[PDB]
């Protein structure tokens, strides 16, 4: 699809960049060290806050509009369980004090992140492969250009 009407590709480039970044940080983190541990969780909190913003922008500026026009999207836009990811990080930052707790938490953190990323990727793929074509049908080219402008503005501060 032409770039100027593509409402998912650039934002998803950023989200994918962020996934790569936290996967790298996760692999290098020494979970036995409290400073490494906290730094990782603070980074995750920031990243997943941006994920949360991303989904919100989509709901408000894209999906909301699309659902109003198509009338055929019955479950639509998954949730990705971001609030619960954030609550997990918060518990690590607030309740984990020593090495035993850090290493037990780490096992669960890794499992939960793997699960999230396993769902996040297909979620983004569906938007690109299913929603984008639909937008092409229910909006004019110029309408989509304007939607993209708003979407980019919200994503980029
Ligand atoms: Fe989404
Ligand atoms: Fe998305």
Curated annotation (Swiss-Prot):
<feature type="binding site">
    <location>
        <position position="58"/>
    </location>
    <ligand>
        <name>Fe(3+) 2</name>
    </ligand>
</feature>
<feature type="binding site">
    <location>
        <position position="58"/>
    </location>
    <ligand>
        <name>Fe(3+) 1</name>
    </ligand>
</feature>
<feature type="binding site">
    <location>
        <position position="54"/>
    </location>
    <ligand>
        <name>Fe(3+) 1</name>
    </ligand>
</feature>
<feature type="region of interest" description="Hemerythrin-like">
    <location>
        <begin position="1"/>
        <end position="156"/>
    </location>
</feature>
<comment type="function">
    <text>Component of some SCF (SKP1-cullin-F-box) protein ligase complex that plays a central role in iron homeostasis by promoting the ubiquitination and subsequent degradation of IREB2/IRP2. The C-terminal domain of FBXL5 contains a redox-sensitive [2Fe-2S] cluster that, upon oxidation, promotes binding to IRP2 to effect its oxygen-dependent degradation.</text>
</comment>
<feature type="binding site">
    <location>
        <position position="55"/>
    </location>
    <ligand>
        <name>Fe(3+) 2</name>
    </ligand>
</feature>
<feature type="binding site">
    <location>
        <position position="12"/>
    </location>
    <ligand>
        <name>Fe(3+) 1</name>
    </ligand>
</feature>
<protein>
    <recommendedName>
        <fullName>F-box/LRR-repeat protein 5</fullName>
    </recommendedName>
</protein>
<feature type="binding site">
    <location>
        <position position="77"/>
    </location>
    <ligand>
        <name>Fe(3+) 2</name>
    </ligand>
</feature>
<feature type="binding site">
    <location>
        <position position="127"/>
    </location>
    <ligand>
        <name>Fe(3+) 1</name>
    </ligand>
</feature>
<comment type="subunit">
    <text>Part of a SCF (SKP1-cullin-F-box) protein ligase complex. Interacts with ACO1/IRP1, IREB2/IRP2; the interaction depends on the [2Fe-2S] cluster. Interacts with DCTN1/p150-glued.</text>
</comment>
<feature type="binding site">
    <location>
        <position position="127"/>
    </location>
    <ligand>
        <name>Fe(3+) 2</name>
    </ligand>
</feature>
<feature type="binding site">
    <location>
        <position position="123"/>
    </location>
    <ligand>
        <name>Fe(3+) 2</name>
    </ligand>
</feature>
